[PDB]
Write an enzyme that holds these catalytic residues in place. Structure first.
Site, short mmCIF file in Angstrom:
data_model
loop_
_atom_site.label_atom_id
_atom_site.label_comp_id
_atom_site.label_asym_id
_atom_site.label_seq_id
_atom_site.Cartn_x
_atom_site.Cartn_y
_atom_site.Cartn_z
N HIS A 176 -4.99 -3.52 10.59
CA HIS A 176 -5.41 -2.04 11.27
C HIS A 176 -6.29 -2.58 12.23
O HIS A 176 -7.17 -1.92 11.54
CB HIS A 176 -4.52 -0.98 10.97
N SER A 213 -5.10 -7.96 14.73
CA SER A 213 -4.76 -6.18 14.04
C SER A 213 -3.48 -7.09 13.12
O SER A 213 -3.53 -7.40 13.70
CB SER A 213 -3.79 -4.85 15.18
N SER A 240 -1.27 0.09 15.55
CA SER A 240 -1.85 0.57 14.89
C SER A 240 -3.03 0.76 15.43
O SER A 240 -3.86 1.40 15.26
CB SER A 240 -1.56 -0.25 13.66
N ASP A 251 -3.75 -7.47 5.22
CA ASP A 251 -3.13 -6.32 5.08
C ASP A 251 -1.95 -6.88 5.00
O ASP A 251 -1.17 -6.40 6.59
CB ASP A 251 -3.68 -5.62 6.04
N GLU A 254 -4.90 -6.47 0.81
CA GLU A 254 -4.86 -4.73 1.57
C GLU A 254 -4.11 -3.90 0.85
O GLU A 254 -3.32 -3.12 0.37
CB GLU A 254 -4.80 -4.48 2.41
N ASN A 291 -4.88 -3.49 -3.41
CA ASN A 291 -4.46 -2.92 -3.50
C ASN A 291 -4.66 -2.07 -4.72
O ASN A 291 -4.67 -1.13 -4.63
CB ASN A 291 -2.75 -3.17 -3.22
N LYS A 345 -7.91 2.72 -4.68
CA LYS A 345 -7.39 2.15 -3.61
C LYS A 345 -5.72 2.84 -3.29
O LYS A 345 -5.43 4.09 -2.87
CB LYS A 345 -7.62 0.30 -3.30
N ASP A 367 -5.47 5.85 -0.94
CA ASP A 367 -4.70 5.58 0.30
C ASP A 367 -3.04 5.91 0.29
O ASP A 367 -3.18 6.16 0.39
CB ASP A 367 -5.53 4.29 0.36
N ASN A 368 -2.42 4.78 -0.97
CA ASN A 368 -1.99 5.28 -0.70
C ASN A 368 -0.70 6.12 -0.68
O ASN A 368 0.37 6.74 0.19
CB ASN A 368 -0.78 3.96 -1.68
N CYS A 403 -0.44 8.51 3.11
CA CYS A 403 0.30 8.90 3.44
C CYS A 403 0.51 11.24 3.53
O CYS A 403 1.34 11.69 4.47
CB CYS A 403 1.34 8.27 2.80
N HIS A 441 5.25 -0.48 4.81
CA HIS A 441 4.73 -1.59 6.08
C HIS A 441 5.15 -2.07 7.09
O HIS A 441 4.81 -2.36 8.07
CB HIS A 441 4.17 -2.74 5.55
N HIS A 490 -4.67 6.59 8.28
CA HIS A 490 -5.39 7.24 6.89
C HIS A 490 -6.65 8.45 7.50
O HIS A 490 -7.34 7.17 8.49
CB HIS A 490 -5.64 6.68 5.77
N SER A 494 -10.36 1.97 -0.06
CA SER A 494 -9.94 0.61 -0.36
C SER A 494 -11.11 -0.34 0.48
O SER A 494 -10.74 -1.10 -0.03
CB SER A 494 -8.60 0.98 0.66
N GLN A 504 -12.51 -3.36 -0.62
CA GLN A 504 -12.38 -4.49 0.24
C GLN A 504 -13.89 -5.67 -0.12
O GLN A 504 -13.67 -6.95 0.61
CB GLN A 504 -11.59 -4.18 1.39
N1 LIG Z 1 2.12 3.38 6.00
C1 LIG Z 1 1.03 3.11 5.20
O1 LIG Z 1 -0.80 3.68 5.73
C2 LIG Z 1 0.74 2.69 3.74
C3 LIG Z 1 -0.37 2.69 2.42
C4 LIG Z 1 0.29 1.81 1.79
C5 LIG Z 1 1.10 1.38 1.58
N2 LIG Z 1 1.88 1.00 2.26
C6 LIG Z 1 3.40 0.40 2.10
O2 LIG Z 1 4.18 1.74 2.29
C7 LIG Z 1 5.55 0.35 0.96
C8 LIG Z 1 5.60 0.81 -0.56
O3 LIG Z 1 3.87 1.03 -0.68
P1 LIG Z 1 4.18 2.36 -2.28
O4 LIG Z 1 2.29 1.49 -3.11
O5 LIG Z 1 4.90 3.13 -2.40
O6 LIG Z 1 5.04 1.01 -3.34
P2 LIG Z 1 5.67 1.40 -5.01
O7 LIG Z 1 6.41 0.39 -4.78
O8 LIG Z 1 4.83 2.24 -5.31
O9 LIG Z 1 6.68 2.15 -3.84
C9 LIG Z 1 8.22 1.40 -3.53
C10 LIG Z 1 9.73 2.54 -4.57
O10 LIG Z 1 9.80 2.15 -3.54
C11 LIG Z 1 11.40 2.64 -4.94
N3 LIG Z 1 12.63 1.72 -3.45
C12 LIG Z 1 12.77 0.52 -3.58
N4 LIG Z 1 14.20 0.22 -2.43
C13 LIG Z 1 14.40 1.15 -2.78
C14 LIG Z 1 15.80 1.86 -1.92
N5 LIG Z 1 16.66 1.35 -1.90
N6 LIG Z 1 15.65 3.03 -2.51
C15 LIG Z 1 15.22 4.23 -2.69
N7 LIG Z 1 14.23 3.60 -3.52
C16 LIG Z 1 13.98 2.63 -3.53
C17 LIG Z 1 10.55 1.57 -5.44
O11 LIG Z 1 11.60 1.99 -6.59
C18 LIG Z 1 9.05 2.17 -5.21
O12 LIG Z 1 9.29 3.57 -6.95
C19 LIG Z 1 4.91 -0.78 1.27
O13 LIG Z 1 5.61 -1.68 2.36
C20 LIG Z 1 3.43 -0.73 1.04
O14 LIG Z 1 2.72 -2.24 1.81
C21 LIG Z 1 2.14 1.70 3.92
K LIG Z 2 -8.09 7.77 11.12
#
Ligand SMILES: NC(=O)c1ccc[n+]([C@@H]2O[C@H](COP(=O)([O-])OP(=O)(O)OC[C@H]3O[C@@H](n4cnc5c(N)ncnc54)[C@H](O)[C@@H]3O)[C@@H](O)[C@H]2O)c1
Ligand SMILES: [K+]
Ligand SMILES: NC(=O)c1ccc[n+]([C@@H]2O[C@H](COP(=O)([O-])OP(=O)(O)OC[C@H]3O[C@@H](n4cnc5c(N)ncnc54)[C@H](O)[C@@H]3O)[C@@H](O)[C@H]2O)c1
Ligand SMILES: NC(=O)c1ccc[n+]([C@@H]2O[C@H](COP(=O)([O-])OP(=O)(O)OC[C@H]3O[C@@H](n4cnc5c(N)ncnc54)[C@H](O)[C@@H]3O)[C@@H](O)[C@H]2O)c1
Ligand SMILES: NC(=O)c1ccc[n+]([C@@H]2O[C@H](COP(=O)([O-])OP(=O)(O)OC[C@H]3O[C@@H](n4cnc5c(N)ncnc54)[C@H](O)[C@@H]3O)[C@@H](O)[C@H]2O)c1
Ligand SMILES: Nc1ncnc2[nH]cnc12
Ligand SMILES: Nc1ncnc2[nH]cnc12
Ligand SMILES: [K+]
Ligand SMILES: [K+]
Ligand SMILES: [K+]
Lengths: 462, 464, 460, 461
Positions: free
Chosen positions: B56, B79, B84, B134, B159, B184, B189, B193-194, B198, B318, B377, B385, B389
């Site tokens: 991003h 990106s 993003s 990423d 990432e 990650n 991180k 971050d995660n 959010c 993602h 973020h 994070s 990196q």
């Molecule tokens: N937008 C952002 O800034 C950002 C930041 C970090 C990660 N992400 C992305 O977000 C996503 C989730 O990451 P994470 O670190 O939380 O992963 P994670 O594994 O910690 O959490 C995913 C969760 O989804 C649940 N799940 C899966 N399928 C499901 C379903 N059908 N119904 C209900 N629950 C279900 C799993 O049991 C798990 O607990 C990834 O794609 C990651 O790359 C986005």
């Molecule tokens: K920002």
């Protein structure tokens, strides 16, 4: 009828304890589920379990689950203040050997453990150990090695006890394998955190009836207990500051909305009074230790605390606070059981209207169990379902019966498989009325799991 | 700055001075990243590194990029999402003489072309020797389309959760050609971050896209991993009544204890493909659904058909396939409110009535909503994070995997995390940036719990 | 000294230790002791007091005595007395008639013991009341005693309501001060006190985990606001019921779902009107209304098995406990905790799963199953009580000419400046530092640097 | 050929209309009045001068007034609060509006004057809707002959009501007013929960700063300071609160905030020595919420932690001494309504200077200046009250009364509780809430009518 193999405060409390056990069973669906699942199989038939853990109502449901699965037990508490006397009475009245009451002396505490180990003055034919904190484990290794020859395993409840086990393993002195029950997620991230969230402010209210809203707290530590403890106080409206030695846990405290401070100037504890941040400690109304470490609320901190501050510990052992210093230097005024005013004016007597005192809870012992009832049944459900599964696993492995070459390959400290952790969790969720979603075959394939789980790699931290 | 510089493609170069102003602010919010600049600039640990970067193109990524450069690297950047980029960040980086191909609102074709512009220089493969990714799209393009370039690459630093999953699948299938570091799963991180990212940016994006009051309304969060935890908090702290769906009973247990009702979109949790398995009473009460899973089709067509009129639908995982937006493109009429905000009229495909009441509001066309409708973020979170990196890049670049004989290469083809000591040192700089004061163990205390005074403080098994 | 009746006089030393602690938690009240001790403004006052005989009330009683008053005291609820507080007050030679676990008959006897001294009416001249029971008995049974009484100071919302009904009907015989509606009472005590003490009482009675469970709070006035927060901060999923749409709006904005036990909110008397699906999911119901039968027989029948039922309004008729006494079997778990077995009236199975848990027999749960509000909150309410007693006693209504009496027969609140002065002492107790306006700033907003800082219409 | 308007960009009208149509669905109390009163046309003949933030929410208010029969001429009550797509959509509907984001002070005055004058002469106004009192002040100072024909003023906000009450006290108020602010569905909805929603919103849009873990000082703890404090605490800030009112300070303590003063022992004596430098040197964000003057003063600004954010969510910008900063320090615009203020001097700055403050919206109302103010579903309550207030005063026809009857009617009043409750009920239904109906026995027991009102007028909620 004819049963005298116990010692409790008051056997006539048994009917009351039984009423509370019947309520607690309805709050512990994972344990009750284990009773139903395994009662026909009797997987603990022939198990003879020495148990040392807080003799609460929750521990009563654990004991009767082990017994219902075929085990015999001999029980003591792992803390002098944590027993609920009606729970102990109900267990004794069911014909189960238990040696436990609230308000034991240190001598009585040791005697109670010994009464589980010995039956009719000789070593009981024990073959399993369930421990919380490692005191029973330590006495068996130092005093009863011949008994450990015939014991198949130890299932250890809590962080401090696990650390003691790992030290023995490192030193080559662990004699039987163990399961670390603490590090199931349905234990550590349920009991250690949410249990203290529930029961810390509970014990403080019962002990002092102090308003917490608007006052200043200092929580020493931000592990699982420190996280739950800080939330217990923040959710009441306290202004909570957090101390830590681990910068990752400190990072979490900052991101969770707490100011991270040290009792020591620039965080350097060099043992001098000059090192104390007197301005900070002079503003603290409540300090809680959560570390499992030694002397994290020390003499110079206690001297600098705001007048009338409350001091308590929710780690396993009382040496987190320098209470020995306070016994040597300051006069103790009992308010009521497990609540003491410590008068900093001197050791010999006190003015009843002195304003320069601290309030110490449970004499520095685990405050949630000492001043309230510890964690609630529906949380302990998780921990004790794990305990039962760990007892089943090690008893079925029959380590004591293995040849020496095979014992050497199994002498370890292990956790339960994630699949069982999840199965305990599911029973807890159903108890709330939660509805978990089932993966489609395509979704399970997409994230690389079986539909029934386990759902996460073993590296996952939740 | 460089004379005649044209090796970039951005939306609007006149935003560069604004971008630079924001980069200078962000530097003050990123003490761990700026500490690495100060500590390592003299040593030039990345001198000779030629980094392909795909993440991003935000102001936060700008500070990461200029940290890698300050430590000696050359980079070529794109990106990892069509929506993003912050255009003022891309402009400031291009204006600094750094090849960057990124703008907010790319098409999918443009998105792929941007990655290829990093891979290619003057029509031929750049002599890249490091990858920072990423989500794994650049990793995939290199393995699939430019496999010979991987012969000169020492490592990938990945990432995000979805990208790591893709790497682990490649490792197990024998198709990963260079070692990688899972950035990650550093605690500074994943659990920073995660989750907290959010928490900060989900309600931010919903407010910027819709300006809807959130207090008092009903939300359904699908997932309760790190992103689901942070997202649920983002909404609950605003006063939403939040329900949580999960397939993982441990995560579901945490949601219950955290004060959420755990529900399934399907009756008894069972999706049998039919509309009859949808809990239409539940979905008919939901004002906002947020997908957080990294999984596929967790907000499916039948759920979309059952949602309350005028509910907001968004995804913060993602990839956009968490929501069946394809079904909505097939069957329902899209009315753009403003960029990345669409009303989706469930009355039919062809036209729509401007005053129709039966629509859903989709944010960012189902792409990561925090980055699509806001700025992702905040700098002080991305600090954690991106410090990881930089350290990962230094570690793999100094290992020189591409220079080893084939035998030694098999021994080091792995997906590893950074050691806990480094994770701790990143966290310490983060804590200091808040003004926090970490206590130092006495020798007796360190002995008592069995750690060094300098750490690490926890066994590798510890979950925080 | 024998002019008292308590559960156990030997608890006096314990109660005195807790009173000394409580004094350090009650800066506004202790400030009144220090500031008025010299004047002795209550010299000659003879106060009939009826309010929960807690440690906090002990500090109030000893403040009135320190300012010159004599008192005779009873509790205003059968379960709210702290026996060690009652004992400490009796051991100080203060007449008090109060213990935890009174019967209804004993409760009435206790009030009568304050009214009568040596078989004759005491020469009372002031009344301090909480809920209006003592006020009611004086008007109905001892109206001639009211000819010598200068005023009533009433603590709580229900009692104030009862005062205004008598004023409207021309049956109020002496002037009264509404202590409840000082901001340092109503918006401190009624709200934050219930925030502290509701989850406290539920834990002590049941030790139930509250996180993750479903609660229904009936009412969202000050008590309902505090009660809802008490539960939400523990992690309950809290739903709120209300008849007042403005209070319901606040619940929505505060992040609660607003629901009715009745379909479309219409309570027409039939089982058919009950939202059985909603009630079948509720783990905890708490009534906060000061109204009658807001947790009714049909709701009790529809509630989830093993739900907890309690009331934190003033009177136990918020819940239809009479229906439950008539139809269901009560199993005492321990004092003030009963399992109510919905399987029938005569006997129960000890392992029956179809029961409700009722706390404090439907009486004020925070005082019945724990200790009520904490000292630092009650500081605000009781500083107002002392000021109100000083004010009515010095007005000397009972001594005025009849036409002068007609002009002063009212129910009034204390002036805002005094409300602010109590608040300032409370803030200082937390170590808070209030800023002082500059002259220009006070001019700019149209207030005095001294205050009052808000018009009387301000709602905070 | 409609030209009687001035907006930034009329081509934004279609976008504004899309957002009005969404906002209608978020404003059930206001749209409920539109549907209820449309046939009766209770504002037929009303000619309303309106001065209030020209947002999408105000757009729905304007079109409700017009739907009920009114004609209006409109301006914004703040130089930065207009949403240009809202202004364009209103102008494109043939409604006179003079408003854009980023007016100068001269333009601001010119816009109000364009509502007052039509074709160079006084408009035949007969009603006033105001937010903060600037239009009310100009009419009293400059157009007394117009006030002779005006039936009433409906005033939105705390500061404007204060100004009305001052005029009433002085005998200078020429027409009656309704204090819309003090409906519970305004003051304890808009002032509190609106700021809860939009303060952290504006700070994120202006700076994108993480708020969790940082230190904030909120000056004031009235309705706006309560909502503002919650806006920050709910994000995880460590929030300290300052107050002059010890009852409000008591609330802050009980709500879990530390109550502090910028000045040692709370004494503001004008000296640098009076500043708690230790405290101010820890603060990352200061927010003023008072409606008072100079509550974030020059000495506080000098003492603030480097790179702290400074902003105001009270009605007027003089809460902060920005004049001091203009006179002494160098301003660097980051982007519109976001300035770095370099405390190194007035004559230029170093681009990498670390010693600066970030000022949002040049100290003007930050939620409206840096974001979009309150959300539609909150403004629904405020603007339902405005419509009801306009109907009430217009129907009273004060301007047509004899002098002796005017004297008995010249007052500043609130709407009755029954209206306040009916507005609240539509808001609760908008959330799907279900209010319970009292039985006859219950209504008798607590002494209320089944339809309400449910509380005495003294009740504080
Ligand atoms: N937008 C952002 O800034 C950002 C930041 C970090 C990660 N992400 C992305 O977000 C996503 C989730 O990451 P994470 O670190 O939380 O992963 P994670 O594994 O910690 O959490 C995913 C969760 O989804 C649940 N799940 C899966 N399928 C499901 C379903 N059908 N119904 C209900 N629950 C279900 C799993 O049991 C798990 O607990 C990834 O794609 C990651 O790359 C986005
Ligand atoms: K920002
Ligand atoms: N009372 C209860 O019911 C209960 C429940 C579970 C565990 N425990 C006990 O509580 C203790 C902590 O358990 P845990 O699971 O949280 O362990 P943990 O390892 O998760 O946390 C302990 C924390 O203390 C910190 N710490 C250590 N020394 C410190 C110092 N000098 N200053 C500040 N912080 C310091 C560590 O960095 C660590 O993060 C153990 O004794 C455990 O057995 C008690
Ligand atoms: N236990 C305590 O410590 C304590 C403290 C203060 C007051 N109280 C008592 O608690 C009660 C409430 O006091 P308050 O100050 O909150 O009064 P309040 O008037 O502020 O609130 C009562 C609320 O109940 C609502 N209500 C009435 N009937 C209802 C029904 N059928 N369904 C739903 N909601 C309904 C009303 O609309 C009102 O908002 C009174 O009896 C008071 O004396 C108890
Ligand atoms: N931006 C918005 O959307 C918005 C919304 C509503 C009101 N307002 C404006 O915000 C301001 C406040 O409105 P309100 O309804 O909260 O008024 P209020 O009277 O309820 O609160 C103002 C508070 O500031 C306190 N105060 C005054 N001087 C102080 C000082 N020197 N230090 C500390 N505290 C001090 C007062 O004691 C009072 O409690 C007004 O100007 C109002 O018009 C803005
Ligand atoms: N209630 C409880 N019973 C047993 N062990 C415990 N540890 C913490 N709380 C406990
Ligand atoms: N969105 C908005 N529109 C009009 N006035 C407001 N005051 C606060 N927010 C507002
Ligand atoms: K318990
Ligand atoms: K109490
Ligand atoms: K808005």
């Amino acid at each position: 009828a004819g049963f005298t193999d116990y010692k409790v405060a008051d056997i006539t409390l048994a009917a009351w304890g039984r009423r509370e056990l019947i309520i607690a069973e309805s709050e512990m669906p994972a344990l009750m589920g284990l009773r139903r699942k395994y009662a026909g199989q009797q997987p603990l038939k022939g198990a003879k379990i020495l148990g040392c853990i807080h003799m609460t109502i929750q521990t009563g449901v654990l004991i009767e689950t082990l017994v219902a699965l075929g085990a015999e037990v001999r029980w003591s508490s792992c803390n002098i203040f944590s027993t609920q006397d009606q729970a102990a009475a109900a267990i004794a009245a069911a014909g189960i050997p238990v040696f436990a009451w609230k308000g034991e002396t240190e001598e009585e505490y040791e005697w109670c453990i010994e009464q589980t180990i010995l039956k009719d003055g000789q070593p009981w034919d024990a073959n399993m150990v369930l421990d919380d904190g490692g005191d029973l484990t330590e006495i068996l290794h130092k005093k009863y090695p011949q008994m450990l020859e015939r014991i198949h395993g130890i299932t250890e409840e809590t962080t401090t006890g696990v650390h003691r086990l790992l030290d023995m393993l490192k030193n080559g002195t662990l004699k039987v394998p163990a399961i670390n029950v603490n590090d199931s997620v349905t234990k550590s991230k349920n009991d250690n955190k949410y249990g203290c969230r529930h029961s810390l402010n509970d014990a403080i209210k019962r002990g002092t009836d102090h308003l917490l809203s608007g006052k200043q707290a200092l929580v020493i530590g931000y592990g699982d207990v420190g996280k739950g403890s800080s939330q217990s106080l923040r959710q009441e409206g306290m202004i909570v500051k957090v101390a830590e030695v681990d910068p990752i846990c400190a990072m979490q405290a900052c991101m969770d909305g707490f100011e991270v401070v040290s009792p020591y100037k620039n965080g350097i504890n060099d043992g001098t009074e000059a090192s104390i941040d007197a301005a900070l400690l002079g503003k603290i109304d409540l300090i809680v230790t959560t570390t499992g470490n030694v002397n994290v609320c020390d003499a110079n901190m206690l001297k600098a605390l705001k007048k009338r501050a409350v001091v308590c510990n929710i780690g396993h052992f009382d040496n987190e606070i320098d209470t020995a210093f306070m016994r040597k230097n300051w006069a103790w005024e009992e308010v009521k059981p497990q609540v003491h005013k410590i008068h900093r004016t001197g050791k010999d007597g006190f003015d009843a209207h002195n304003d320069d005192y601290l309030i110490l809870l449970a004499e520095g012992r685990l405050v949630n169990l000492g001043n309230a009832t510890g964690h609630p049944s529906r949380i302990m459900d998780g921990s004790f379902a794990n305990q039962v599964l760990a007892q089943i696993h090690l008893f079925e492995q029959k380590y004591a019966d293995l040849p020496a070459a095979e014992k050497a390959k199994r002498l370890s400290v292990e956790v339960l498989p994630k699949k069982l952790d999840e199965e305990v969790a599911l029973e807890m969720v159903k108890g709330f009325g939660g509805v978990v979603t089932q993966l489609t075959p395509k979704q399970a394939e997409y994230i690389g799991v079986s539909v029934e789980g386990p759902f996460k790699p073993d590296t996952y931290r939740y």
